[PDB]
């Protein structure tokens, strides 16, 4: 029974949520595991960059952002054709290649 | 006469000892168990009786094959090798 000027609240606790509580006590150990896997990968690829292949210049869609520049999924095939690098050689070199990206500009 | 005179004329049995679970559940008329379901090929278990599950999980009996499976796992599943003799 709501009384004397509170918010008209709608709590979503009508299901069996206590069986499905996801406690997050794993997460500092998970940060340790991700750190160990990242260091093992960096020791695996010994002269190569630890982050990975080169990511392209990519501008955000959805006119909210519209000015930020991101890292992309990969360089497009027209970009590889103008740069003079074959699409099956660029992956061996360490250049990100995806065949899905258009190039309208 | 539904009490003591009805307990008096109890002679013949309905359930006997089964031969897969060994409990007194093998019904002589239906030829079924109802504790494991012997004429069925699958073991009778249900999730509404977790107590009856943990009466016979895999950690109950002798585990006479599964414990040496665990030991051969921690050893490495090697076969036919002998240690170096004296």
């Amino acid at each position: 029974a709501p009384s004397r000027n509170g918010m008209i609240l709608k709590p979503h606790f009508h299901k069996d949520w206590q069986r499905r509580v996801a406690t997050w006590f794993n997460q500092p150990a998970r940060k340790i595991r991700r750190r160990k896997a990242r260091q093992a990968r960096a020791r695996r690829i010994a002269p190569r960059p630890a982050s990975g292949p080169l990511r392209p210049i990519v501008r955000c869609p959805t006119v909210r952002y519209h000015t930020k520049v991101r890292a992309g999924r990969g360089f497009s095939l027209e970009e590889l054709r103008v740069a003079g690098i074959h699409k099956k050689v660029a992956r061996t070199i360490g250049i990100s290649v995806d065949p899905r990206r258009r190039n309208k500009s | 006469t539904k009490g003591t005179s009805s307990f008096g004329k109890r002679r013949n049995k309905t359930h006997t000892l089964c031969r897969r679970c060994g409990s007194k559940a093998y019904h002589l008329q239906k030829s079924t168990c109802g504790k494991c379901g012997y004429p069925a090929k699958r073991k009778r278990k249900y999730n509404w009786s977790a107590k009856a599950k943990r009466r016979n999980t895999t950690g109950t009996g002798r585990m006479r094959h599964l414990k040496i499976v665990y030991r051969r796992f921690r050893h490495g599943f090697r076969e036919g090798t002998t240690p170096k003799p004296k």
Binding site: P49, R91, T92 | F77
Partner: protein, 122 residues
């Protein structure tokens, strides 16, 4: 008095059967002495005789199974007791060559475009 294993590794099979029969005679006599009472010096030897029977039968089973696997070693279909038993799925795995079988297209990919070794910022 002790029947060990090193002295049984090199004996003939009929002599092993004769020693086994002598141990069975001594085992039956010690059971008769156990039932008639006898003494504790006769009650204590039945364990030694049973373990000696176990050792003789163990050495016989060793020699016959190494002879059978020396016989079937080389054939393509060997018996199920001689086949290796690790686990069910591990016996139902691949052939250690079938996992390494690659197609001609994948070999052509790995041959024409191998993963190169590189470094940056120089």
């Amino acid at each position: 008095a002790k029947i060990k294993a090193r002295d049984l590794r090199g004996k003939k099979k009929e002599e092993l059967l004769k020693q086994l029969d002598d141990l069975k005679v001594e085992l039956s006599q010690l059971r008769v002495a156990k039932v008639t009472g006898g003494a504790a010096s006769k009650l204590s030897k039945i364990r030694v005789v049973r373990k000696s029977i176990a050792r003789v039968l163990t050495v016989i089973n060793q020699t016959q199974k190494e002879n059978l696997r020396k016989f079937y070693k080389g054939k393509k279909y060997k018996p199920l007791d001689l086949r290796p038993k690790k686990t069910r799925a591990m016996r139902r795995r691949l052939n250690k060559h079938e996992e390494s079988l690659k197609t001609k297209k994948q070999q052509r990919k790995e041959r024409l475009y191998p993963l190169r070794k590189y470094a940056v910022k120089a």
